[PDB]
């Protein structure tokens, strides 16, 4: 159960309106351009293509300019993963390249043959965020019952039994290694 | 037979529900309650029955639509404290 947050720094009036993200047990927040370049999408525009699904929308792109200004330092994949790894010698890349598979958006895939999925999805989140920031769509209703779940006997007993059975198979592992 | 459908709130967002099946039809009683005529046409669903918005405890309340809501709440609370046959055995 991981929680990804995409933060928009700089309120209405500030000039440093950059967009960063929070990755699982990684020290500091990472600029979104660095994330996209770490996923394989290196040049600009293509990132904006992954974010802004309408080239006519000049406002959204205008809002995306300082993000490009932010991630202008990193211009390739290797140094992007190197950046994330520096946060968290080449081992760090393999650390980084792991976080983008096992920890960064696990609900789509935890495999290794999927990078465009998480990239497009991240771009979708950016799109929603900016749509909310441009006053085109208001804040999400956190009291909406449709976006809530009721765990009954099933799921509860499922969690509990997963715990107890994992403890059991662990104990059995111990009795096994005892022999 | 596609006569009834299961709808959660999320899908409920995208539909138009008729309150009563008499809202599909194209000098009055002053006693009866005032009901706004259907200004909506494109219905996709109709309520089975509005009284199904209530739970088990509030379904015991006689004429809850003639009460102040906190009284319905209070009655809903006190219904669980009434005596009587809880089980035959």
């Amino acid at each position: 159960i991981s929680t990804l947050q995409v933060k928009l720094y700089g309120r209405e009036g500030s000039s440093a309106r950059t967009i960063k993200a929070t990755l699982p047990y990684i020290k500091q927040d990472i600029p979104i351009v660095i994330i996209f370049r770490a996923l394989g999408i290196i040049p600009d525009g293509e990132i904006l293509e992954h974010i802004c699904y309408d080239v006519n929308d000049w406002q959204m792109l205008e809002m995306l300019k300082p993000c490009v200004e932010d991630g202008f330092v990193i211009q390739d994949r290797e140094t992007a993963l190197d950046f994330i790894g520096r946060r968290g010698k080449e081992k760090r890349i393999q650390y980084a390249k792991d976080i983008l598979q096992k920890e960064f958006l696990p609900h789509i895939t935890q495999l290794e043959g999927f990078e465009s999925r998480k990239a497009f999805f991240l771009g979708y989140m950016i799109n929603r965020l900016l749509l909310c920031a441009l006053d085109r769509k208001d804040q999400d209703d956190r009291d909406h019952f449709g976006k809530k779940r009721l765990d009954l006997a099933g799921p509860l007993l499922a969690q509990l039994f997963k715990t107890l059975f994992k403890k059991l198979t662990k104990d059995i592992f111990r009795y096994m290694q005892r022999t | 037979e596609g006569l009834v459908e299961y709808i959660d709130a999320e899908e409920e967002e995208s539909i138009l529900i008729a309150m009563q099946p008499e809202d599909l039809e194209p000098d009055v009683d002053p006693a009866k309650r005032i009901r706004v005529s259907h200004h909506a046409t494109t219905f996709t669903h109709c309520e089975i029955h509005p009284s199904m918005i209530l739970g088990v405890a509030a379904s015991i309340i006689p004429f809850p639509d003639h009460n102040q809501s906190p009284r319905n709440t209070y009655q809903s609370a006190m219904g669980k404290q009434a005596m009587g046959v809880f089980l035959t055995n």
Partner: peptide, 30 residues
């Protein structure tokens, strides 16, 4: 006939079709 539209009283026939199959504690059992 049998193609006429429902009234408002025939609704409780459908509600009776419900519960007769589901019961009152359906979510628990399911």
């Amino acid at each position: 006939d049998e193609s006429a539209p429902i009234t408002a009283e025939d609704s409780w026939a459908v509600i009776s079709a419900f519960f007769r199959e589901k019961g009152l504690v359906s979510q628990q059992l399911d």
